Amino acid sequence: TQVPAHIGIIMDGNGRWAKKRMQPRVFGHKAGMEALQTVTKAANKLGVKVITVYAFSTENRPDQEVKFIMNLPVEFYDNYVPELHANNVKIQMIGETDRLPKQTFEALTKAEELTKNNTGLILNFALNYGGRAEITQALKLISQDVLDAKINPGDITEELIGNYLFTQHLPKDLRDPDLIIRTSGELRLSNFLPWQGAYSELYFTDTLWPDFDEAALQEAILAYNRRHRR
Amino acid sequence: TQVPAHIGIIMDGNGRWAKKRMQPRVFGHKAGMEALQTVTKAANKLGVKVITVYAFTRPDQEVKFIMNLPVEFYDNYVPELHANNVKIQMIGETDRLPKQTFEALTKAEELTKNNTGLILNFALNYGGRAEITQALKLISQDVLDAKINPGDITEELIGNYLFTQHLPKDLRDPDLIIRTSGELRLSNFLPWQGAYSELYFTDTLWPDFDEAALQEAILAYNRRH
Numbered sequence: 001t002q003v004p005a006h007i008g009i010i011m012d013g014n015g016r017w018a019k020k021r022m023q024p025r026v027f028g029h030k031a032g033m034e035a036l037q038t039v040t041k042a043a044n045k046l047g048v049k050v051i052t053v054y055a056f057s058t059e060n061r062p063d064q065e066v067k068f069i070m071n072l073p074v075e076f077y078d079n080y081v082p083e084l085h086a087n088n089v090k091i092q093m094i095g096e097t098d099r100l101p102k103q104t105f106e107a108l109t110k111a112e113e114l115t116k117n118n119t120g121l122i123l124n125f126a127l128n129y130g131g132r133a134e135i136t137q138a139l140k141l142i143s144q145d146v147l148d149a150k151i152n153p154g155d156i157t158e159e160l161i162g163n164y165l166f167t168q169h170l171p172k173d174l175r176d177p178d179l180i181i182r183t184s185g186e187l188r189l190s191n192f193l194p195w196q197g198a199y200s201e202l203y204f205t206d207t208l209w210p211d212f213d214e215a216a217l218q219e220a221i222l223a224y225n226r227r228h229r230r
Numbered sequence: 231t232q233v234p235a236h237i238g239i240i241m242d243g244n245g246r247w248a249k250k251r252m253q254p255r256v257f258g259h260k261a262g263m264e265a266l267q268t269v270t271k272a273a274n275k276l277g278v279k280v281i282t283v284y285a286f287t288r289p290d291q292e293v294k295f296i297m298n299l300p301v302e303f304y305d306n307y308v309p310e311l312h313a314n315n316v317k318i319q320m321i322g323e324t325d326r327l328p329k330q331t332f333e334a335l336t337k338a339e340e341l342t343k344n345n346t347g348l349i350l351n352f353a354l355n356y357g358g359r360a361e362i363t364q365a366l367k368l369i370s371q372d373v374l375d376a377k378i379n380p381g382d383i384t385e386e387l388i389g390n391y392l393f394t395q396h397l398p399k400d401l402r403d404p405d406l407i408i409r410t411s412g413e414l415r416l417s418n419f420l421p422w423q424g425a426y427s428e429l430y431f432t433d434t435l436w437p438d439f440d441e442a443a444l445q446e447a448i449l450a451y452n453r454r455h
C-alpha cells in the first residue's frame with residue numbers, strides 16, 4: 001500500500017548538529033534519540049514493518065564515538081523504550097555481542113525481553129555492526145557445519161547465507177531493506193547491510209539526523225514511490 | 231585534487247537513449263560501446279588504475295544482436311585499447327556464456343595480459359551475492375580438504391576468494407561507484423568491495439557519458455575530501 005516494508009536508516013550528523021548550536025557533541029546525540037523516537041513512532045503508524053537503524057559517523061577520536069554509541073541502549077531503555085512498548089513496537093539488535101559493556105548488554109536484552117510479544121513495527125538496532133563482519137561471521141558458522149556434515153559445499157546458496165546473517169531473526173520476506181536512507185549529505189553506505197541492501201533503493205539528504213522527522217520520512221517515502229513510476 | 235584509483239561504473243540508459251532518437255535498441259548498445267571506448271581511454275589518460283564496468287526482459291531477437299557485440303568489440307575496439315596499454319579482464323560467471331562470446335573474451339584477455347596501464351574490468355554475468363556465495367563455497371571446500379582452519383576465516387580471506395582477487399591487492403575495492411541514467415540503486419554491484427565507496431549518481435544516459443561526465447564525477451569525488 002505505497003509503503004516500503006523495510007527501511008534502513010544511517011543516522012549521521014548528530015555531531016555536526018550539536019556544533020551548529022554551540023553545544024557539546026553529547027547534546028547532539030540526545031537529540032538523535034528524540035529523532036529516532038519520532039521516526040520510529042511515525043513509521044509504525046504509516047505501515048512500515050521493519051526499520052534497521054545505524055549510528056554511524058566519520059566526524060571524529062574513535063574511542064569517543066565508540067563510547068557514546070555503546071552508551072545509546074542504556075539511555076534509550078530508560079527514557080524512550082517504555083513509550084515504544086506502549087506503541088506496540090518490537091525492539092531487536094543486530095551486531096556483535098562479545099565486546100559489549102555489561103550495562104549496555106543488560107539494557108539491550110531488557111529492551112528485547114520487554115517487547116518480544118509485540119506485533120507492530122520491528123525497530124532493529126545495528127550496534128557494533130559491520131557488514132563485512134556480519135558476512136565473515138556467517139562464513140564461520142557455515143564452514144563449521146560443512147565439517148560437521150550438516151550441509152554440503154553444494155548446499156551453500158544465496159538463500160542459505162541469508163539464514164546465517166544477523167537479520168535471520170526477522171521474517172523471511174522482510175529481511176532486506178526496500179529503501180536505505182542516509183542523512184548528513186554523505187553519499188556512501190559505510191558497510192551498512194551490503195548483502196541485504198544489494199537491491200535497495202537509496203535516498204540521500206543533506207538534513208542532519210536530529211532534524212529528520214515524520215515529515216522527512218514521508219518525503220523519503222514519496223521519493224521511493226516515485227522510483228516505481230520510473 | 232587527484233584521481234581515484236579504482237572506479238566502478240554501472241552502464242545504464244542505452245535503450246532510453248535510442249528511444250529519444252527513434253532508433254532500435256541494438257544501436258543504443260552500439261553507442262554505449264563508443265561511450266565505453268571514450269571513457270576507458272580518458273580514464274587511462276587521467277591516471278585511473280582500474281575501471282569495473284557493469285552492463286545491466288528484452289525481445290528474443292535482441293539477445294542475438296547483443297550476442298554479436300563482444301565479437302565486434304574485439305574486432306573494432308580492443309586493438310585500439312591494446313595500443314593504449316590497457317589490460318582487459320573479466321569478473322563473473324564466464325562458464326555460462328556462449329562459445330563465440332567466451333572465446334572473444336579470452337582473446338581480449340590473452341591479447342592484453344602483459345599490459346601495464348589501466349585495467350578495464352568487465353563485470354559480465356555477475357551478481358554481488360552470487361560472487362560472495364561462490365567465495366564462501368570455495369572456502370568451505372578448502373576447509374573440508376583441511377587446507378584452511380576455521381579460525382583463519384577473516385574479511386581478508388573472503389576478499390582473496392572474490393572475483394576481484396585477480397586485481398592487485400591495493401586496487402580491489404572501488405574508490406568511487408558511478409551510476410548513470412538517473413537510477414538511485416546499486417543493483418547487486420560489488421556489495422562487498424564497494425561497502426565504503428563514494429557513490430555518484432547522474433541522470434546522464436550511458437551513451438552520453440564522456441570525459442566531461444568522468445571529470446565531473448572525479449571532481450565530485452574530490453569535493454568529498
Ligand SMILES: CC(C)Oc1ccc(CN(CCC(N)=O)C(=O)c2cnn(Cc3ccccc3)c2-c2ccc3sccc3c2)cc1
Binds near residue numbers: 284304328338352354
Ligand atoms: C567479451 C567481453 C570482452 O566483452 C563483453 C562484456 C560483457 C558481455 C556480456 N554482455 C552480453 C550478454 C551476452 N549476450 O552474453 C552483457 O552483459 C551486455 C548486455 N548489454 N550489453 C550492451 C552494452 C554495451 C555497452 C555498455 C552497456 C551495455 C552488454 C555488453 C556489455 C559490454 C560489452 S563489451 C563488448 C560487448 C558488450 C556487451 C559480453 C562481452
